Paper text:
The ‘TELSAM’ variant of the human translocation ETS leukaemia ([name]) protein sterile alpha motif (SAM) domain is a 75-amino-acid (9 kDa) polymer-forming crystallization chaperone that is soluble at pH > 8. TELSAM reduces the entropic cost of crystal nucleation and growth by pre-freezing some degrees of freedom in the crystal lattice. Additionally, pre-ordering many thousands of copies of the target protein along the polymer results in substantial avidity to strengthen the subsequent target protein–target protein interactions that are formed when adjacent TELSAM polymers associate.
The 32-axes polymers form a continuous interconnected framework, whereas the 65 helices make no contact with each other. The 32-axis chain A vWa domains make C2-symmetric ‘head-to-head’ interactions with 65-axis chain B vWa domains, burying 341 Å2 of solvent-accessible surface area. Along the length of the TELSAM polymers, the 32-axis chain C vWa domains adopt a zipper-like arrangement, with each vWa domain contacting two other chain C vWa domains from an adjacent 32-axis polymer. We have identified the phenomenon of TELSAM-polymer flipping and were able to largely correct for it by differently scaling the weak and strong reflections in our data.
Residue numbers in the entry: 3 to 255
């Protein structure tokens, strides 16, 4: 499971009842020795004032861990959803790269806010994180300039691209954010790559993320249905901006 809705808010707004809820959720998510619901009889503000020693004093068996758990929640700030762009830059898209860039550009510019964090990942014969997971506007702007300078060449090892999104969802994802993976590609895979891509996409859904596939050029509908979570999460680029704008506006509540 994942942080409950009440806990999706910044800790500073947490009620005393929220703090108790947080403790039980943590015990299950981290297999901790159960603690009394009255181990932290205070609100979020007060919890923020406690030292790590206070946590260890109140919970000798799990206080250090709970304290660190709280730090990670704080590190997400106001983020509510993380959006990962896994972009095909193979030779097949060398004459339609601007179509891919404009698609990322419009969605990025639309949803830049303290609630959103973006990552730009490109993949061909090798994968590269162009923009690490961030919600900072200046970083997002430079990331778009880097993205416009991609020279599409190579094979289509989409599993490598999805791996770079999975790793970030493990390290920085979860907690108060829902992760979405937008793979733009034509779905023309070779050899064992289809199995690798489906295996890598299986990791993504195990991390609680939803995989969307945006078909570029004459795209392989069947393949993208095996990468994405379902048939309804596979659409072409034309209208894909309006389609994704609705699903993101929806996940915003």
């Amino acid at each position: 499971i994942a942080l409950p809705a009440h806990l999706r808010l910044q800790p500073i707004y947490w009620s005393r009842d929220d703090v108790a809820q947080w403790l039980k959720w943590a015990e299950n998510e981290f297999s901790l020795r159960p603690i009394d619901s009255n181990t932290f009889e205070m609100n979020g503000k007060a919890l923020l004032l406690l030292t790590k020693e206070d946590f260890r004093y109140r919970s000798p068996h799990s206080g250090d861990e709970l304290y660190e758990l709280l730090q990670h929640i704080l590190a997400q700030a106001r983020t509510v959803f993380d959006l990962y762009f896994v972009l095909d830059k193979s030779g097949s898209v060398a004459n339609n790269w601007i179509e891919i860039y404009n698609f990322v550009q419009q969605l990025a510019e639309r949803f830049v806010s303290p609630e959103m964090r973006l990552s730009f990942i490109v993949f061909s014969s090798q994968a590269t994180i162009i923009l690490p997971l961030t919600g900072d506007r200046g970083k997002i702007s430079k990331g778009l300039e880097d993205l416009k300078r991609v020279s599409p060449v190579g094979e289509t090892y989409i599993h490598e691209g999805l791996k770079l999104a999975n790793e970030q969802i493990q390290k920085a994802g979860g907690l108060k954010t829902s992760s979405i993976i937008i793979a733009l590609t034509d779905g023309k895979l070779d050899g064992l790559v289809p199995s690798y891509a489906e295996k890598e996409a299986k990791i993504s859904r195990s991390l609680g993320a939803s995989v969307y596939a945006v078909g570029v050029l004459d795209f392989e509908q069947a393949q993208l249905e095996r990468i994405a979570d379902s048939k309804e999460q596979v659409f072409p680029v034309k209208g894909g901006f309006q389609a994704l704008k609705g699903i993101i506006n929806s996940i915003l509540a």
